[PDB]
Symmetry: C2
Subunit: 240 residues, 2 copies
């Protein structure tokens, strides 16, 4: 039965019907067995497109709400619709967080798995934080940081600095500092350290995932360029 | 109340939440009053993106179903999922066709409106025909052709050959002949006549919609180029 669900999930992915895809992989998860790396990635892809649609819509409607200041009639329309989108967004995140607490994190035997799922837990509390309302926000932010931190400690011990999951964790944990805690200095430090540590040990890349590692390293440096304001003029060869 | 619904529909359009958009304009339609040209276009846009998502998914899963011939295990998966998508697709089309019969077509006072809605009726029976199963298909195909034909007769009498609705009707009625009746000769004749008649009376374009007319004329000629196999080599100036 779980193989049928996985194949239908792959079929929904091709059709770009990500609600179906998430439903299929939710059923697989609820069977209780530890997910394979394929199943783990299908669940991740599915719920990143389900929640992503609400995050995109939320940003559009928030922008309209802000640009209709002094137009109370239009701004009330935007505010109420934003709150409708937020409700959908929370239900998705709570759905993911339940699966992580009840099934994925407890059944994670290998270190790679538990970093993946704790990073995922940090992500979906971060998405809740993006739309949180002051009082509840504090607790949501703490839950996100605690998940990121435990994942950070495990991956630092068990993984090479070039591992894609370790790099991807640094990418998102840095963004958490920059966007949620409004701490760009801590965010840049985290991103620079992870990039530097990977550049140092490039010999520890594997053929199975050197393309993924190098993409995430480029994303890390892109965020640094964005956050520090570097570049803008074409470079010419020069020594280090 | 209808102005609030229209504004929320415009808000859903910007957020690309087309289910919401269709729901808003369905409520507006069900109020019974004749729709303005703005409301008419919002309803059209909304349901063309709702049904379009199913048509796109249907084509992906149909292609996988065809490419898994001789792989009965995978092909059964695709077939069943295709049939799930078809059920959603029919419910959308029946929803539109109900609105057209109960509200839009009866309340259409001006000729431009009744051509628009009869063209729309031909479209959504055409979408049903795209997924119909032999016995029911005949009746569905007849309903589509009858709607297109009545729209064709009204627009020929009341509209200039450059009017976007008249041109758009020719574009879809031709595609109906090519794809549903498998009659490329009749399809090309219909498209060429409409293009030629518009080229003849270019002086009858208006500033309010000359860009739309010229786009549809280009679509008409594109289909002709596709269906006759014309072109392929760069042209040089030469007399007519």
């Amino acid at each position: 039965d779980k193989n049928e669900l996985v194949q239908k999930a792959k079929l929904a992915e091709q059709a770009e019907r990500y609600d179906d895809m998430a439903a299929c992989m939710k059923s697989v998860t609820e069977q209780g067995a530890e997910l394979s790396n394929e199943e783990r990635n299908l669940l991740s892809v599915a719920y990143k497109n389900v929640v992503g649609a609400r995050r995109s819509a939320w940003r559009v409607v928030s922008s309209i709400e802000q640009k209709t200041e002094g137009a109370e009639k239009k701004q009330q329309m935007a505010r109420e619709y934003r709150e409708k989108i937020e409700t959908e967004l929370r239900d998705i995140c709570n759905d993911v967080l339940s699966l992580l607490e009840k099934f994925l994190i407890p059944n994670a035997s290998q270190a790679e798995s538990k970093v993946f799922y704790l990073k995922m837990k940090g992500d979906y509390y971060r998405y809740l934080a993006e739309v949180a309302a002051g009082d509840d926000k504090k607790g949501i932010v703490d839950q996100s940081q605690q998940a990121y931190q435990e994942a950070f400690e495990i991956s630092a011990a068990a993984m090479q600095p070039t591992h894609p999951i370790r790099l991807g964790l640094a990418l998102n944990f840095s963004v958490f500092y920059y966007e949620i805690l409004n701490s760009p200095e801590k965010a840049c430090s985290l991103a620079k350290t992870a990039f530097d540590e990977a550049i140092a040990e490039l010999d520890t890349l594997s053929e199975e995932s050197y393309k993924d590692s190098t993409l995430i390293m480029q994303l890390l440096r892109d965020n640094l360029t964005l956050w520090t304001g570097s570049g803008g003029s074409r470079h010419s060869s020069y020594p280090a």
